[PDB]
Amino acid sequence: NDTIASQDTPAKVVIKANKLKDLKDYVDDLKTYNNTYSNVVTVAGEDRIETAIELSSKYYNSDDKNAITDKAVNDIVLVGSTSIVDGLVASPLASEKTAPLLLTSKDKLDSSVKSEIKRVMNLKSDTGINTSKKVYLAGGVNSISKDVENELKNMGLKVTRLSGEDRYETSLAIADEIGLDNDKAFVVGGTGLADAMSIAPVASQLKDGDATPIVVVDGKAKEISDDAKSFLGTSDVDIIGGKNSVSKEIEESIDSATGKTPDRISGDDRQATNAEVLKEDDYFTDGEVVNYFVAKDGSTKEDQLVDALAAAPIAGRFKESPAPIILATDTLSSDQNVAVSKAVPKDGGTNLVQVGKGIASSVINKMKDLLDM
Amino acid sequence: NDTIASQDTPAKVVIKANKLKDLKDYVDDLKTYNNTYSNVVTVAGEDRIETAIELSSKYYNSDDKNAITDKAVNDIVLVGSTSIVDGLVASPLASEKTAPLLLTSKDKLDSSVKSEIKRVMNLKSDTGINTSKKVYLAGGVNSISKDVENELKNMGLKVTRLSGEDRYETSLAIADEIGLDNDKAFVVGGTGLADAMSIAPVASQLKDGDATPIVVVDGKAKEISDDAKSFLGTSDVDIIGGKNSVSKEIEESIDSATGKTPDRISGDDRQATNAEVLKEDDYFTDGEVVNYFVAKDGSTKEDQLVDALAAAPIAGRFKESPAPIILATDTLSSDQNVAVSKAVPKDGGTNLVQVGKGIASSVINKMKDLLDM
Amino acid sequence: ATTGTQGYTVVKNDWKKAVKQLQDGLKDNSIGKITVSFNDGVVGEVAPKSANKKADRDAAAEKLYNLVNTQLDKLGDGDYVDFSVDYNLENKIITNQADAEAIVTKLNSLNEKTLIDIATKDTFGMVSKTQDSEGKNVAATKALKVKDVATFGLKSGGSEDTGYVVEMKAGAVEDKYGKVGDSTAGIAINLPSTGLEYAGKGTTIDFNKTLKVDVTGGSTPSAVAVSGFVTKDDTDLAKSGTINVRVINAKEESIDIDASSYTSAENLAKRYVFDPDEISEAYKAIVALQNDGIESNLVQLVNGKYQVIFYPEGKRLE
Amino acid sequence: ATTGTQGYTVVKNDWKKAVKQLQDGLKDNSIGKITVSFNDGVVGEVAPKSANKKADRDAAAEKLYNLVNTQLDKLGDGDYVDFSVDYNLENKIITNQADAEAIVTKLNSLNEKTLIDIATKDTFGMVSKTQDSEGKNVAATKALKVKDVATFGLKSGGSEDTGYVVEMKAGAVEDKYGKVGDSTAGIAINLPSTGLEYAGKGTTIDFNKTLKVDVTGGSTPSAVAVSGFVTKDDTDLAKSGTINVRVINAKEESIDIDASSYTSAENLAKRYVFDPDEISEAYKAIVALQNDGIESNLVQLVNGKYQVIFYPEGKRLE
């Protein structure tokens, strides 16, 4: 009626009760609190830049239990910290390249970021930086200036810039690098920032190594661009967002070009659209989604969606079960609550990762309830 | 007349010359600059506390080429950042225990230090802190307060305090933990702080796992303490420092107690004594010392010898060839210049580690010349 | 001996009682040999030179204590002492004469307990040996008590070397079994002829079965018998084998949920990290026991309270 | 090819000339086969169907270019192309009739060069075949020039298929070797009977040894000979074997120490990290060559300049 304990154990815990039911309840709570203090992690710094670094340090070149890689990486994806628009579709790139998505100030490369780059890639004075060490700049000069690009080159790294004359051309530059190999692509409107962040984790899900590209299109135009049409070829397209993000005209345009009827995952607002991504069976299976990420929705400010941008690749590759990102600053929507409820198994969730500061307590609490944590 | 180059090589460097001698000179300079930008490291932060952390992060639980250990450690040695006197003889303890020597503020455990402790010991929320994780506090309450000791206990670490009513009793507490197992001990005067730092690397040299203890004695007293006599037993003693640090009376006292004639390694000043430690054949072999550490001498301020304190264990265990510490803030002494000259082989030095900020450039340059770097 | 094994884990504070039990075991001849280890290394071996000699068993017990008392008493963190205990319950004896007399007085405390009541017209009981003038049974003077059935006391020829033996001697009863006013002759009361001895060979007297009446026939009784000593195995554990005991430098944490003040499950999680599989398996064993009839090693009834045991990995950070 | 093995490393910028040399090698029949690899994977094999046919050799050369020209021209970072070259210099031929005639005219430009001067009383030279009335040697009419020794021109039966061959035909000389006024008879001049052909079998004509006079005897000469074609190996490398060539996407850094402006050793160290053992071995090879005359593969004389090659690990941080 006993086992021989390890010599290093700090205590012998004997939990007694007259009633087996009172014991049951205690041991249940113990389990919950044990798992919760173990699997309910917050990954945040004081800045948006620090949050991205925290993500990189935890998940890339890390001994952490849920790390994407334990060895040094060969690729970085860098995004302008303010410019959510330029790097909007960079998450699937970061995923495919086995790279952290880091944020930098536009003018000067942040010393914090420089340090993390050295750490994650294992760059040292005594060791040569061979041509396999690569840094992708997602955005033009207005998001990541030439000054920063030259500073990265000066340290001895190969620097490829994925950019165009506008957000649309820039997205195609990024999407082109990712490649449309699995006959599937995601399309988002120019202003549909939260929508791109809802789908980013899904796009970041790798199948035989390849991520799925996201393309930004002019949602109020008569037609999409020749470049978009050429890139999209004859692939299945899922439009993320409502008519106000990507019009009826654009849907037809994509229909005509591809010759295949595009799907539409959308809601009345950003939180509804986020819920729909989770509810969509193609992206997630009912009662088989255990790992979850939470980040701000960008209702207060749009550029605060960069937390989700940095997190999305990790969410896509997380453990052995891809995770969505729930978008919520102050409050979860009714649609989200439902979505998670149907997504999570009977047993409940096994991982919850809050990304960034300023996410209200009710939100995490609600998530913990829904996941039984 | 050629080799098949690696695919990842950034260039093919062809160095040509009409005169073989001009080539010789170029390739010689190349070698020097190549080794120097590789093996002449500075390890310093903005604070004394940060310098110690930098040392820990570089050499303990590190993938660095010259790291003391690549896995997580089980022991920390903590010292009050201002109190050089209390932790004076802690370096050989840190060495024997395979521990970094960290510095903390007396009242509040520094967040920087707390973070490094977690990193170096690999402490995590999801993993249990078993009873093998130990933190030694070298000093009484006036160097490291109860507040800090309780804060370390609260994190889940075993905390043993090595202290006494004064510096002398505290040294014996530390020396007692190290153990006088190899029938040998070092003795330094109460005011001989620089002398203790000169010998600390030597004391930190392990032989069959064991370091050699250092004991502080009242240098102007008629006799050493009963506790010192009891600890020292019948062992060989090497006194470090001149008459003004440890009197003739004390030498006799140690002679009488041990029954063995104590040696004396000393000079007219601290820099001379430092040189003598290097010149002493028992501690270092002529033309076989290639690795060198440099730190401030404490002439400007005595407490600035904490850099040497933190470095000394690493110096003792460095690579496969123990290193001394040269004590010099603004200038090397004539004795030091000579000492290194005789110490270094014909080939020159292979490693130079500057520890801390305010070491003058002439000093490092002189060292680089003496070591042919 | 080894961390995952079946065996006992004694905390430091209780080392004295644990060693005393091993000493008692050596004295009463339960334990043939104890191999002692300080951490991973075997340091000593305790065994009486001849089990049949009392002095040799006491010598073994003294040596055992002398060896380990300082190591256990001053046990540091991470240190532990393992005892591999070769035992054999069939060799166990009652080596103290005071212990044998303690059983005799335990038996004597039942002397006044009524086994069979005096008979009535409705209910069967004790009747007289001879019937009335009409040829019907009449009630007995007194009820049948334990004092009427047998006397107790230790047998002659016992010793500390070989062991003592509590003995039961059958009495005599003239009164018989029947109903008052019944024509059928009272049935003779069969007194204990067997199970008259008890040596205590790793077994204890089952008082539910010892000196109990056994009426045979049901509605029409034909025979009445009173049992002698009926024993029971004092443990579920095997008669012979080897047992591993380990002392560790850990504090015992008593969490009584029924108490006025106890450590909440939250604060317990805050203080220690538990192995998830250790908990989940314990929880599943509780749920299974609650919902179905399924008993488990993980959950057990001890001292009128259901309990689980956890040896956490270590303390939790912060 | 494999990293660190013996073989050639061509930078991207020079891929065109490298492939042209392989093409020329295929055309002139030096190269029997080339196995091509894009990165680690073998993608193609170039070889003429029959080496004796010109068309087949040209076809091989065209195929080689067609295969690799896009891969090499657009070579990305980390990518490389390896050529395993089965060669045999003995099979090498002169495929152009213009090249053969260029050698003939090169030989014909020596026709007026005097090999042996007319004899004097002091110095040995050319004398007449018959002595004067008194029985002493008399000076020859003309000196011995190259035109007197042999005529040049390409041999009949040559073709682009099999190859052309420059031929030397020995002349005739009546005049002999001696001193004027000497009684001993003039020594017969041995004209070239061997080395009359040159096909260019991986060799070039050594003009220091070709058509040179070889007087035997010293103070008292006994024999005089004029050599035919004496060749020299155009490269130090073996006649037959297999060689590995690798193109990489790296920039070439020419560091000429004799130039007005070059990269200082400091700035070079600042820009790249070098393998310490790669340098030390190179330095030791230079010192050894400087002090002791010991030659090495690591340091070599090329175009009147001593050179070393370094392939650094990568660029240096900061």
Author numbering:
A (entry chain B), B (entry chain D): 2 to 374
C (entry chain A), D (entry chain C): 1 to 318
Study text:
The surfaces of most bacteria and archaea are covered with a proteinaceous coat, the surface or S-layer, which is formed through the self-assembly of individual protein subunits into a regularly spaced, two-dimensional array. In C. difficile, the S-layer largely consists of a major S-layer protein, SlpA, which assembles into a paracrystalline array enveloping the cell. The major protein of the C. difficile S-layer, SlpA, is post-translationally cleaved into two S-layer proteins (SLPs): the high molecular weight (HMW) and low molecular weight (LMW), herein referred to as SLPH and SLPL, respectively. These subunits then form a complex (referred to as H/L) that is incorporated in the S-layer.
Our H/L structural model reveals three distinct regions: a pseudo-threefold symmetric SLPH tile, an intricate LID/HID interacting motif and a third region composed of two domains, D1 and D2, of SLPL. These regions define two separate planes, with the SLPL spanning ~35 Å above the SLPH plane, linked by the LID/HID motif. The three CWB2 motifs form a triangular prism and adopt an intertwined fold, with a β-strand from one CWB2 inserting into the neighbouring domain to complete a β-sheet (β2H in CWB21 completes CWB23, strand β6H from CWB22 inserts into CWB21 and β10H in CWB23 is inserted into CWB22) sandwiched between two α-helical regions. The environment- and cell-facing sides of SLPH exhibit considerable charge differences, with a mostly negatively charged external surface and a largely non-polar cell wall-facing base, decorated by positive patches. In the crystal, two H/L complexes, related by pseudo-twofold symmetry, are present in the P1 asymmetric unit, packed in a 2D planar array which is then stacked to extend the crystal into the third dimension. The 2D lattice is achieved by tiling of SLPH, with interlocked ridges of SLPL molecules covering gaps between the tiles, creating a tightly packed layer. As hypothesised, the p2 symmetric 2D lattices of native S-layer ghosts (a = b = 80 Å, γ = 100°) were consistent with unit cell parameters of the stacked lattices in the 2D plane of the X-ray crystals (b = 78 Å, c = 80 Å, α = 100°), pointing towards a similar packing. In contrast, tiling of SLPH and the SLPL ridges generate a compact lattice apart from two distinct pores in the C. difficile S-layer array. Pore 1 (cyan arrow, between molecules 1 and 3) is ~20 Å across the widest point at the environment-facing surface but is partially occluded by the LID/HID motif narrowing it down to an 11 Å wide cavity. The second pore, formed between two SLPH (molecules 1 and 2) is fully accessible from both outer and inner surfaces of the layer.
